[model samples]
Target: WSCSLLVASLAGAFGSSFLYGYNLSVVNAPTPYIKAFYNESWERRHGRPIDPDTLTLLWSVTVSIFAIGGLVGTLIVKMIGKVLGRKHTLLANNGFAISAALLMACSLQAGAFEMLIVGRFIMGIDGGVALSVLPMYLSEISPKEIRGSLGQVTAIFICIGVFTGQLLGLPELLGKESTWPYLFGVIVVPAVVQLLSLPFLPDSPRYLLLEKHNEARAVKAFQTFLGKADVSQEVEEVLAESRVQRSIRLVSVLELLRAPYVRWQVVTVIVTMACYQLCGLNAIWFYTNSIFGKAGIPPAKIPYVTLSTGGIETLAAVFSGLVIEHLGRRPLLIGGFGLMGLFFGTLTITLTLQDHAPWVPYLSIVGILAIIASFCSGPGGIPFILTGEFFQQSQRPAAFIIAGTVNWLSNFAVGLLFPFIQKSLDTYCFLVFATICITGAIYLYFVLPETKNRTYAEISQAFSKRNKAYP
Candidate 1:
């Protein structure tokens, strides 16, 4: 990879990517502190202590609002990507993060619990924008030779963020009762770094050349990103692709859904994204404390164990980048979903028999670890990159918009409903996820071709054939 690509990876990973994981897990360790603040604020306002069930309901809203804000963020992705361009849009997002950090950091002293929920909502907007734009930028900027690995950078940073959030949330760190405010403050670090450094990086060459029609600027960007001046061949390929797509006027989600040539790619994008979100990973991460508690981990050790899961996920994501080129996309994703189903199925059976079998809970821990590792290997990261692969510049942005919308909406559903499902089904809730994984694996195995080392045209052509096969 060129220096520009490396710089972009670092900036994207640490800046936007880190916030996604940080906000997701940050709320986990500080639940008690946040809940108490809500109760205290409620008492101050209403002159009576809040009911426990009402407090639980309010706390769930605070926890789930991030996903709701994410849904709102997706609504504006096309406009942001079009107007600010990817790099600038990312820079602009720091405003949301810094503001969120300030609101959350001051919520304690201000005695304003509403600020915490609103802060989370704003941070969710930052996350939604970053998650969509970062992957798109990485894929557009990276050379095709290293595209798969570079694309996984988004997932890599997310894993790292989760791990960092977990570590930071530990009692010795910001996870303590008194230290929770600083945990929110920590988000500003990445946002500030991104604001200061991202300007040094180049814009997406495709956006410059094809979208803006700026040849000189595009050439400079292309050379900067590839670290070589001889970009004639790549430039021609991009131009030719652009010519075919120019007549579309504007590509919207409605247009994406209507176009015959790209519709199947759209389906693939949606299903793959759904696999990433709905395969039970978010539910596991969101409710790790409760899950770990049920699996017999002591209260004190739960954070540490949760921290280990994040580490495992990060390690698996790193390993995935290394092997993605060699293994290709299909087997890794198919195997990932299959393995997740098997692990969760086993986890269900183990938990079901834990009363009679004293050894079952340890197996449950092993099961959770295996599930996370399996997810990281493929479904955890691949779907985001696949959006760029399956569509050209005209359709890619809209595709990402749709995919991001689905992902966040599904995340909201899981976060919002999983608790109720857990109440009703108990351990059997995972059985539903297990079924989804196995079913998704079977459907995608026959449908998704290996997209490794292929151009957009080649991947689209492959999808064309599969569209007929599966239609």
Candidate 2:
């Protein structure tokens, strides 16, 4: 990658993509302190401590409310992106992160637990915007040769974000009552870093040329990111494709959903996104911990094992990011899902047969480790990247909203529903996840093409048969 190219991504993702994941894992260690803090704020305002029922309601909403903000951010991404463009939107989005961090940092002393709730929600909006915008900018700006790798950076940093937060989340560190506020305040560090660094970079050339109506600036952006002086061919090529965007006009989220021609494209994104959440990683975590507990690891040591997933996850993400261009995305997504299916199947066997053999329960550890690695390797990142690649510029925003909304809701659906499925079915619960993994793999194996090194117009035409697109 070019120097500017490399620098831009690091700053861009740190604010938007990085924080999205930081919020995912960072809140975990502070959860209990924050809970007691909630009760404290409750009693400060009212005559008595909150009732158990109300505490449950407030605490649950406080934790899960980020996904609600996620929906709002995705819905508004187009409005923001079209006007500000991807680069500026990411810069502006830091405003949300800092605002949320302020509320989070001071909420305890401010004598209001409601501040934490709003801050978490605002951070979600920041994350949602970053998640949507970073992929768009990364995909639109990079040469197709590195597109997969650049997109994989999204998941890589997210895994890093998860691991870093969880690492600090260790009781040896920020898990303390006094230090937890700093965890919320950590959001400001990345937000400020991005604001200072990213303003110096250019917007997506596609955004500049087609949407912003500034070919002069667009030409400059193209030369800068492409890392060459003679981008004459590049500009000519971009304008020809820009004509198609000009002809059709930008598509709305509703029109993208309602249009009959784009049905399978819609289906493709939804299935992959839903499958990304459902592919059994979360379920395996549940199984993995209990396996340790039953296999004689003490209850207290279980969290240490939980923390290790971030390590394994980040490891897998980097290795896969390196290899995606060589092996291609289609196989990785399918193969990754396929491996998780096999691991889920083997996990169930190990959990069920634990008492049958001395080492059977230990094998569950092997099984769970493989599944997390398999998940981060491909399925964790490719789906988000795919949403950007599968559509042209006008329809791209709509695609992201649809994908992000589905991703957010499916995330909730799995988080909400998996426990009941586990309660009733126990070991068979993983088999359900395996079935889902396999179904997703099989559908993708047949349906999805290798998007490696392809352009937006080329990808649209690739789907023309089922899309019935006359491109």
Candidate 3:
């Protein structure tokens, strides 16, 4: 009975990750084409090309708009998810899908870059809201025993979506001016599909039982999976759990510092999350075309390379999903990140010498593959998964919201600064990311605890290993 509920929840929870990835990477293959479009349009309109730095900053603002919207959307999820509920929250996010698609389509039809940025900005809000709520929703529905594994489905789905976006956004499809708008239209199909599927999803049983205190409905929800005998016990257990569920309000961010114990745990999560972003990944994703061009590859071939990278990441994520249960997170994170830092360090060196070294380009391919694998197994899989596990049930929603906000904000920061960083800092970007990864290792070694196979309460020691464990 427990296994059945976990399996059913996994399918829906993981599917959303696809949307997340598809949206982020869709911009990757289209970036250069979009830049050219804007530059050419500006030249024809203003009779002179805009300053390169100004153009780059304009592009950065377009990209950063998504994060800004995401920050807002993640905050709104608290009210939406609590009121409309998770399934409804999922349904509401579809508005972003439709809005983004319409905006992009309009932009393409009218040759307006502003419209495209507006569309992406709205989609960013949906993505942020989904990220903040989905993990907590899945964790609440899943049994404690398999919670870690189930929570990880969120990351897995995200990787899958990323690969899908990469594949769909290939130069073959969008490099030509004619097919670029098709990329925007692709998002519409999924949004319609999601809306159609929403009616079938069960509202989270835990939320119904705990927040609503409607035992009868909650029991019926349990009985749909569990037998009658099992339903009563499940309800009683959930109720008891809810009674002790801590209250974690938004304003609690300040109070979190009042207790050194909570403060330390919060800091660890923030730093861990910060490291994930600073890995110069945003820089890599944004400037891959430039990197490929520097590697002597033509613009035409870049999308295929991007596609190849995404395929590798997808394969690697599947492998990570299989082993995450047995191998546990710390080893995968520590070992993988330890190696990931080396990959970036080497990639930086290779890029620096690409002008002189014949072998540098091929070496970078290997580095990109290794880096993707490392992320799938390392911090990528752990942070969101652990956020759900480490915090109390009441804390799960708020923790995820805060973490998701930070993740997107970091994403925006890296993306907004990417062009300048690549133009000015170049190889220095990799060094910066490498340093961040190394710092992450030290942070994990000292703070991150093993939550594998442990219930939320059982793993409270993770928050205060050196101090006293929470009761």
Candidate 4:
């Protein structure tokens, strides 16, 4: 089971989770070069130079269209997942990725900046589908004990993807203009990697039994996934649908919003994911310049320092993945948010007092690193695991859609509004995220039950005490 299970995770995540993070930072190192390409195109067409504002518009659209495509991708995943099943959905998503790579890769050669925008849009679709489907597949495929670790594979590859982008994105590497198109195309290799590898692995047994109702194949799926000849008990447990009626109708995202039976489940997902974004990791990421600069690193030398923050993020996510089963979800998630809030509160003061207190900058450095460490420990990846755990296969697709919507919507809010907030609130801008963090921790402390090593019915029943319709 471990042999095949590990390969399945690596195969799916390489195409899905890994691709998401690379694209996130992909355009970063090439920002100026891409903008210059736009300018070069603008100038060649018009007699006069392009408007500064026009250039800004084109450049920003090139960057932000990824999110638009991300939203589009998010909305459509349920349709594919419910109809096509998880394994095939994973296989099919690479169509977007391979196509996106070609579209973006040739933008520089084709000499149309607009092509780059559409290319980025397609990649966003791949990311949305990839991010959502990988977790669903991983969550369904594993046993209770290793489930925590397996789900974090997405976060692991995600940070790994970001680091890959940052490391290879150096001016010495693909970040240079003449070299960038090939770099944009680099993702196709992993897309193809997963493409080659996934068909050899097992489809999720839960999906097959629950949705396909193929008990015989599910037995073999169980045999393979659990790596045991005595898989009758595992198959029995999957069929023990006390709460799940035989018809297990697929759900609408809107019905999920209004359905009384799952009201708290929905509310809990909404709260966790809403705060997941609003918890200010993105804001912390945006503060990377100030964090490194205060630690006495020079501006020109910052990419490597930023690279180090990525280093710690990947390292910290690994630490959390290892400890999740032993330590359980409640403590780590609550503690991560609590620690982040504490650090955010102190970092704001340290940032403001950097001039007056000689020690402030150094401590601000400590505060910055602490925030990243705390987030990766649990807050960053656990909510996604919880999303699948909270719902049955029939409901997981809709659950992901609602969660994805809130996740991206709040993320967009922070990206669009946080800069103006920093200008107005100065260092106190972080206090907003800190407030969300502390509040989120307290909310979960009271309301969220521990799902560690628990079956889906057991986990939902834990929420039953608070769910009005549970009776």
Candidate 5:
């Protein structure tokens, strides 16, 4: 049953994820060009070799600023999902997407570092919005049977977007003196495609029935998936239970804090979101080129290594989608964080050895491979899944917003500080991420519940342990 919905919704749901991957990875492919583009201005101002740490800091802000936009997007996802419907909210985000692409294109074309950073920030908003809300839309529309599999389509497209972006965005291709702006402009393809394709998506039946108070359309949506209106009885039962089981608005976001039940879930989503990011997969993504450079891979091979990183991450995401249901969500989180911590610890040590040993770079490569592999198995795959499924239907949109906000906040923080952290700690960068992962694993063991094969109502009601433990 869920499998059918996964197929039915794939086109609609996966596009945003793809766009997410594309927008996020696009920056890495052209780093050298971007560095060169900024060279003249830095040389004029400082008259010394550009501070790599400073450049990296700006780059972090460039990427992290998008998370700020994401925060705005997540903050508003519920309102947009409610007012305009999930389909419309997605459509609305395209405006920002196009604007961002144009801004980035122009900035790159003109060699405008400030403008490019601003454009990247705007682009972050577009992406942040999609990443938070799209998963909610997918989860709400999907049936329980294959919900995890179907929802994971987000991961699939995200991977595709990452790979595709890296493929087209090769620094040689876009990093040219004149073409980098064109590379920035290139994102318009996915943005335009998303805007054009969104019309075919059905609004979530749960949203239609529960939020819009439209029973008829909800029935139509159910039939659209189930192939019969005969499920109307089941639909009605689900709707009635949903109403009773979930909390609705009368209280604003502030009031959610005033209510204990609402507050607990809100905190849970926020912390879980931080866990998603703090586990450190994205830190690597945002700075893989620099990491490889530190590993002693020359500037020449950076794009290939970056692409390889994306490839490894994409494959891991695919494997994660396949196994998430069988092994369950919490274990993935725990195990993913544990292995990531261990491998990254090794990566740090290898990075430190580069000055003395030739084999250090090779070891760094193997360590990164392990880090990426373990990451895909757990935090990379499971966090988004857990965030979407953990909330009650009525509260889900809000929970998703909180989850996404937390994700971006962590993304921004990590991005902003990582360069300095890397410079100061040198090889110790992995140690910081290791600490984060250890904290996350502890949370998973003690706080995160095993959300395997549970329904919305059952999940909400079974909070007796008060942490994430499940029996």
Candidate 6:
């Protein structure tokens, strides 16, 4: 990797993707402390103790509100990307993170539970912008030879971020009562680092040439990113693609949906993002320890087991990045969904049989392990890369907005309703996700094209041919 690309990846990971994982899991370990704060604030203001059920309802809102803010952030991502460009947009997004950190850090001292909820919402907005922009920026800057791998680095970093959040939430660290505020505040450290270092990195050369029409700076961007003065080949490719796209007006989401060729790409991204959430991933991750508890693991060993599974996700993502260039995107995605469904199917059965057999809990453990590894290997990383591959620069930002909004909305829905669903369905809950995975995999098998090393025009053309032939 070039120095510029490496710097940009690290910046995007920590500054943006890390916040998603950090904030998502950070609240899990501090549930009691935060709920206590909520109750304290309620009594102080209302002159009465809050009921347990009411506190649970309020805490659920606090957790789910991040998804709401993420939805709002995604809706505006296109406008922000259009106005500020990808790199600067990320820089500006730090303002949201920093402000959120301040509000959350001060909530305990000020005796204001509202600050925590509001701060979490702001962090969600930061997540929305980062999720939309970082993939676009990373894809544009990456060389095609390594684009699949580099594009997938986003997933790897997100896994790293999730693992980091898990680590910080350990009681020996920031998960305790006094340090719970610091858990939310600690995100500011990376945000500040991203702010300071991002300005020095090169912006996406594609954005420079195509969007800004600055040929000289675009070539310079290539030089800075590739670590050489001569960038003739890359420049030629960009210009050739730019010439074709110059006549097409940047399509809005409405126009994109109306245009037949582009509509499938939009549908592809939306379905992929939605299924990525609806596949019961959040439910699994949120309740892994509980699943292990049912599997009869001793209480003392559950944390280590959970931590190991988290590590497996990170390791598998890194493995996917290494293999994606050779293996291509479609196969991994189809295979991932298929394997995830199989494992979840096994989990459902194993969980159901644990009471009937003495050794069935061991099967459940294996099923969980395989499911986590399988997900990270393919489904977890491929869709975001495909999103970047599926559209031209003209339509990419708008596509991201629609896709990101779907992703966060699905995330919110699952977080809000999964417990109720799980209560109603019991072991059958895994069946819902298993069905989703099987259905998604079959659809993807028939419709999705291999996008590795393909230009956006080539990818779009492939879809156009399929649409014409199928229609």
lDDT of every predicted structure (CA atoms): 0.81, 0.77, 0.70, 0.79, 0.71, 0.79
TM-score of every candidate relative to the true structure: 0.88, 0.83, 0.88, 0.82, 0.84, 0.86
The sequence of per-residue lDDT tens digits that candidate 5 reaches over residues 306-346 is 77877887888878766666788767778887787788778
Clashing pairs in 4: none
Error of 4 at 43 (Å): 4.0
RMSD to the native, candidate 2?
Answer: 4.0
lDDT of 1 by residue, 354-461 (tens): 778667777888899999888887666667667777776766767767887888888887777776777789868798889888888998887887788778767767
Per-residue error for 232 in candidate 2, Å, reads 3.8
- Where does model 3 exceed 4 Å of error? 1-15, 40-48, 140-146, 225-230, 246-251, 298-300, 355-357, 388-398, 446-471
Please state the error at residue 248 of candidate 5 in Å.
Answer: 5.8
On lDDT, the leading prediction is: 1
Superposed on all Cα atoms, model 3 deviates from the true structure by an RMSD in Å of 3.4
Q: Tally clashes: model 2.
A: 0
Every candidate's CA RMSD: 3.2, 4.0, 3.4, 3.9, 4.1, 3.4
Per-residue error at 385 for model 5, in Å?
4.0
lDDT at 122, model 6: 91
- Candidate 2 CA-lDDT value: 0.77
- Which parts of model 1 are misplaced by more than 4 Å? 1-4, 211-216, 229-241, 248-252, 255-268, 355-358, 388-396, 445-471
| Poorest stretch of ten by lDDT in candidate 1 | 462-471
On TM-score, the leading prediction is: 1
Q: How much does candidate 5 score in TM-score?
A: 0.84
